[PDB]
């Protein structure tokens, strides 16, 4: 695409500059260009890809929630008819959001996942695939909603199976995956008990493994454990 003429290393360098400038749309475009060079990504490069798109889609999701709330209020009894504008604009933001999700899913399918053989890369990409199907599920209201939900579930499940066999229970990718799959269960799959069980079990197994860690790894793992605890406190 438009990044085909720029060196891979320059795209990476510019992605890091865009991050410092909080220019996440640019950061994502640079990282897409880097992926499209066709080489596998290092750990740092995978993190840059993930940060960039999570920030872009995070802004779109927050805007979609604002607009969806306004639209829902407009459809309550006693609300004045204001025309098609709220629906139209929510749909515009929704279509943009879906486009970003499709872009990320396309990078994962062509060809990040198939080339990823180490547990740390494969689990990371499968988690991403689950996340972007989950974001599609957040806005899905039609006949493919069940299939979108099952695509998220299937990607998360494969990531969980690999992470349990190949990673320690304190590994940050394993922990972040479990956090997100637990959110999937709670608010996408209508399975709050599964969400709570997964969070509590993940937390307890990580706690039992902290003794093996250096001080820096302990800080990394406990940070994510606190997110699991935050959700357990909210949900129980």
């Amino acid at each position: 695409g438009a990044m085909g003429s720029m060196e891979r290393a320059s795209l990476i360098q510019k992605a890091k500059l865009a991050e410092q400038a909080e220019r996440y749309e640019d950061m994502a475009a640079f990282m897409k260009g880097a992926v499209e060079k066709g080489e596998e990504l290092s750990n740092e490069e995978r993190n840059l890809l993930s940060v960039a798109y999570k920030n872009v889609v995070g802004g779109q999701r927050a805007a979609w929630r604002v607009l969806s709330s306004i639209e829902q209020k407009s459809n309550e009894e006693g609300s004045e008819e204001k025309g098609p504008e709220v629906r139209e604009y929510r749909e515009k933001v929704e279509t943009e959001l879906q486009g970003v999700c499709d872009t990320v899913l396309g990078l994962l399918d062509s060809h990040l996942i198939k080339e990823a053989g180490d547990a740390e890369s494969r689990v990371f990409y499968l988690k991403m695939k689950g996340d972007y199907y989950r974001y599609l599920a957040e806005v899905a209201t039609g006949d493919d909603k069940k299939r979108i939900i099952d695509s998220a579930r299937s990607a998360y499940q494969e990531a969980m199976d690999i992470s349990k066999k190949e990673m320690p229970p304190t590994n940050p990718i394993r922990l972040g995956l479990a956090l997100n799959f637990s959110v999937f269960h709670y608010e996408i799959a209508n399975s709050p008990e599964e969400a709570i069980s997964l969070a509590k079990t993940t937390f307890d197994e990580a706690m039992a493994d902290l003794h093996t860690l250096s001080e820096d790894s302990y800080k990394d793992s406990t940070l994510i454990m606190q997110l699991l605890r935050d959700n357990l406190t909210l949900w129980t």
Partner: peptide, 8 residues
């Protein structure tokens, strides 16, 4: 209080 997902 919005639930946490894996975000910085």
């Amino acid at each position: 209080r919005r639930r946490k997902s894996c975000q910085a």
